[PDB]
RNA sequence: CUGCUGAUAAGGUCUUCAAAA
RNA sequence: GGUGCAUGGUUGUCGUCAGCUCGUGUCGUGAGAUGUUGGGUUAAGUCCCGCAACGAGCGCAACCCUUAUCGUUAGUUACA
RNA sequence: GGCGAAGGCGAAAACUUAGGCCAUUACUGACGCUUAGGCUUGAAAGUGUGGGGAGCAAAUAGGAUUAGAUACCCUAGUAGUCCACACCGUAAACGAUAGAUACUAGCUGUCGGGGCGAUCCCCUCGGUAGUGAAGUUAACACAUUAAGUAUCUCGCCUGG
RNA sequence: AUUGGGCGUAAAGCAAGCGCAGGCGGAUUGAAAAGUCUGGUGUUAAAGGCAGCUGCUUAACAGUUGUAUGCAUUGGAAAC
């Protein structure tokens, strides 16, 4: 089968966000609750969804389908999308989400002309450069790739998005519910169930729950473009995983003293 | 505010003088100057219809010439080189009969973006009673499809014979007005209307001049063959 | 043969640091008569530009209409701010006894004969809103069916 | 770091229009 | 001769101050908002970061002239 | 932050006395909600008679400022502010939101009773606050203490 | 504004309470049948209204047939 039970509870996909940062309409996926104050899972809600998502992305890329990957968070999952981007070439914005990067496809799709036509004019070269407008030039092509590097591959708006965290990236799922594209996600119990339509409960602040599961996804994707897969179908020896640097681990949610009341009296 | 004159500015840097010549005494270059305004204005104002893009005149001590550039000069050639006889008759009584003329058309190449006549033809249809935003718009059109850079119209008076004057502009693409490297053809032009005055100033700016001199050059006169006669 | 009509030409307009900033909004109505009506409101420096925004924007946002027998079905009160619109089903014969705005709307979208009031306000955008509410918020009589386990509208 | 500090005749333009290219 | 309160053209002033807008997108029933605000740096809406905004035009700057050092070309009617 | 229906209530004590919250294997057995008319209370100012008068201060006098100052500032200053007994019955008397009843996400404090027993903290029942989705609104905003879904009764509104 | 409106900021919640009369009111059983529903009968003058037809050259108009509403009595229904 795809995963393990015991490797899902041992990465702590099972664990939410602290009770008081919770979404009532979220209930279905968390069981009746109990003294753990880190809002536990269901793992067969967990593993359904994980399926249900993993069989709809690798349909899509079958039949040739774009889809892009949206992380603009921790730099962990910066850098995890763009290793992910460099195991499967599909596309991602690891840097802030431009407005309209959807609903407003045509001006940044005259962007990245812009940007592919600039890295051509450099590569092909000339000595007319010289030193500081070749630098000017090369200052632009760093600004445009750090900001449009992922995005420059496709010419089409994407079939679907992976969204790392839809509470953090209201705007990217908000773009594909008004464009009318699916959108997959990790909610984490305090997300609107609404707005996600292949809606994954998972945990979202464990950089090795996080990993496991955007690489399942991508795993996915590899196995319908046809490479060797990574994390998916696989046994212990070769799932396992370390926890990044810098007892148990703790995902609790904590620095509430900086939530002050609005400024207000008179 | 008030801006400095587009072609004013330009002069003697990037755009050689339309009357080259140098007179004698004070008396003499007063006689000369009024002439050449006298054969241009006639040039301008009347045999209108053939669309004189700009008339530049080369004197010596005595001998005059003149390069006539326009758009459609069937219209001063004539049925078989009749009005011509009557244009040179006509220069010949304004300078003088004991002067040499040296009169020279010039079929001008790619007319659609040269100010002068993008405005003489915005004038006509002000005067023909052309409803204006449909003129602008299709005077803009067809000056951007001609293959130029930005256009600038404004067209300012008594508009559609109202009783209080507004203007209308109508900038599509980039005119760097400040800029003198830019290659900016300005004109402007009355249009005699049944209510009054209607006057329109036309900006057009045609590329950026990278080479350095004072002219010497054609300007848009060079994408077809520019060679039409009527000399000796 | 998506025919469109103007309900409403405004000239609204700002203040600046001297003088007014004066555009025209536009108020268009986009049907084809068969079944798809969208509405547009646009704002412009000219007419032109704001008419071919507002057809631009009513084109973009279509909704489906269904009709019974030429008809709206059931009597409905649509809703929008203080505008309240009534529409009443009619026979075959009536025609539109609609007048502005929702005539407007009901011609573009195709239906033959309604009964129509306005009950609230008279600002063309609101009314329209009721009316597409109004028109929206039916049901045709197979999803109450689906709905009640009935067999397809029979007694 | 709190002195003092009052008033301004009447009526008025200015959006013609999108039918459309 | 009248009407600059019927106008074209030209000009003063805010002010050589740094502003004025537009296209697409999004928010709002609507006027409208965003971009143009926030943090640094400038004479500057000059530029860089941030950011439901992405870009663009006019303005700013540079390109133009002259003064400040030098090389080369030329040496009369300069110099000698 | 607590109490009362509202006005309102803050040095200590005694006496008399009103209501409320929680749990009830107890009792009466629809006896309840609202309330035209009626009655009771009702900040401060004001009235009448008798006391009291430290401080403050309408009216009043003077000095300043000012074009003028019958005002703002200052120095004095009567009624009044205080008590008892009788009236007056008005307030931005405001949560600008009548009372009663049932239902509708959640999160953070705080006060009281009850369950456990160091505090702290957990649960239950209520009071009083903040934030907040559905829902409502012209918008601001309200949002289980509703301005939401509905019922009952009373009062009130119909351009300036 | 019974059908068919409102009272936080636009006109409109009495300053608050104790409250007689009035309006409304928990659950179940039985009776009667004052409201409610339904059948029969009498009547609600003619003209007028609506539908059909005839006659005026068609119409306006005239004539002709049908056409409700309420009350009373009597016979049943018992959900509120
Ligand atoms: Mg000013
Ligand atoms: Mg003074
Ligand atoms: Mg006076
Ligand atoms: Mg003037
Ligand atoms: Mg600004
Ligand atoms: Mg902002
Ligand atoms: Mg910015
Ligand atoms: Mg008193
Ligand atoms: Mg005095
Ligand atoms: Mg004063
Ligand atoms: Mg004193
Ligand atoms: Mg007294
Ligand atoms: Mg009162
Ligand atoms: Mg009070
Ligand atoms: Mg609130
Ligand atoms: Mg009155
Ligand atoms: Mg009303
Ligand atoms: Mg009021
Ligand atoms: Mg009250
Ligand atoms: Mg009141
Ligand atoms: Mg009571
Ligand atoms: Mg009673
Ligand atoms: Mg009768
Ligand atoms: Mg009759």
């Known amino acids: 089968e795809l995963v393990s039970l015991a490797k899902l509870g041992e990465m702590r996909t099972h664990v939410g966000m602290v009770k008081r940062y919770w979404n009532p309409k979220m209930g279905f996926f968390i069981e009746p609750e109990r003294k753990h104050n880190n809002d536990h899972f269901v793992l067969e809600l967990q593993r359904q969804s994980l399926q249900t998502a993993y069989n709809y992305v690798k349909e899509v890329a079958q039949n040739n389908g774009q889809i892009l990957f949206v992380g603009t968070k921790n730099d962990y999952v910066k850098k995890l999308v763009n290793n992910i981007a460099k195991r499967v070439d599909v596309a991602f914005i690891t840097q802030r989400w431009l407005g309209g990067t959807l609903t407003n496809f045509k001006t940044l799709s005259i962007s990245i002309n812009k940007l592919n036509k600039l890295v051509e004019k450099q590569a092909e070269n000339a000595a007319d450069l010289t030193k500081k407008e070749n630098l000017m030039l090369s200052r632009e092509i760093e600004r445009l790739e750090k900001f449009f590097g992922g995005v420059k591959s496709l010419k089409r708006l994407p079939n679907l998005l992976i969204v790392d965290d839809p509470v953090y990236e209201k705007n990217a799922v908000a773009e594909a519910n008004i464009l009318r594209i699916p959108v997959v996600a990790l909610c984490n119990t305090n997300t609107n169930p609404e707005l996600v339509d292949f809606i994954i409960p998972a945990n979202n602040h464990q950089p090795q729950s996080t990993c496991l599961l955007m690489n399942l996804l991508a795993d996915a994707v590899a196995e319908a473009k046809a490479m060797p897969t990574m994390f998916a179908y696989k046994p212990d020896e070769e799932i396992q995983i370390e926890i990044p640097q810098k007892k148990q681990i703790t995902s609790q949610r904590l620095n509430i003293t900086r939530n002050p009341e609005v400024l207000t009296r008179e | ?232 | 043969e998506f025919e469109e009509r103007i309900v409403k030409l405004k000239r609204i307009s700002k203040t600046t640091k001297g003088g007014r900033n004066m555009r025209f909004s536009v108020l268009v109505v986009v049907g084809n008569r068969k079944g798809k009506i969208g509405y547009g409101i646009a704002k412009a420096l000219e007419v032109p530009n704001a008419i071919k925004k507002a057809i631009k924007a009513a084109h973009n946002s279509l909704h489906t209409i269904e009709i019974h027998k030429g008809s709206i079905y059931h009597e409905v009160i649509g809703r929008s701010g203080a505008s309240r619109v009534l529409l009443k089903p009619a026979p075959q014969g009536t025609g539109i006894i609609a007048g502005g705005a929702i005539r407007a709307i009901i011609e573009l979208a195709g239906y033959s004969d309604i009964y129509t009031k306005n009950l609230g306000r008279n600002t063309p955008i609101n009314m329209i809103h009721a009316t597409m509410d109004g028109i929206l918020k039916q049901l045709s009589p197979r999803r109450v069916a689906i709905l009640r386990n009935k067999n397809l509208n029979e007694l």
């Open chain 2, 1 to 232: 505010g008030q801006k400095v004159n587009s072609n004013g500015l330009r002069f003697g840097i990037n755009k050689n003088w339309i009357s080259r010549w140098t007179a004698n005494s004070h008396a003499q270059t007063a006689k000369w100057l009024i002439e050449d305004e006298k054969i241009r204005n006639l040039f301008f104002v009347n045999y209108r219809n053939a669309q004189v893009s700009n008339v530049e005149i080369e004197r010596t001590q005595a001998t005059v010439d003149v390069f006539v550039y326009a758009a459609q000069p069937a219209f001063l050639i004539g049925s078989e080189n009749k009005n011509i006889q009557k244009i040179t008759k006509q220069i010949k009584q304004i300078i003088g009969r004991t002067t040499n003329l040296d009169l020279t058309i010039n079929e001008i190449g790619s007319p659609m973006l040269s100010a002068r006549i993008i405005a003489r033809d915005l004038a006509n249809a002000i005067e023909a009673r052309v409803p204006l935003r449909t003129a602008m718009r299709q005077s803009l059109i067809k000056v951007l499809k001609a293959g130029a850079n930005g256009i600038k119209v404004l067209v300012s008076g008594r508009l559609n014979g109202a009783e209080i004057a507004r203007d209308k502009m109508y900038i599509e693409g980039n005119m760097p007005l400040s800029t003198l490297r830019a290659d900016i053809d300005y004109a402007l032009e009355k249009a005699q209307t049944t209510y009054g005055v209607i006057g329109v100033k036309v900006w057009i700016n045609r590329g950026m001049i990278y080479t350095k001199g004072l002219n010497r050059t054609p300007a848009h006169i060079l994408h077809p063959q520019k060679k039409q006669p009527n000399r000796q």
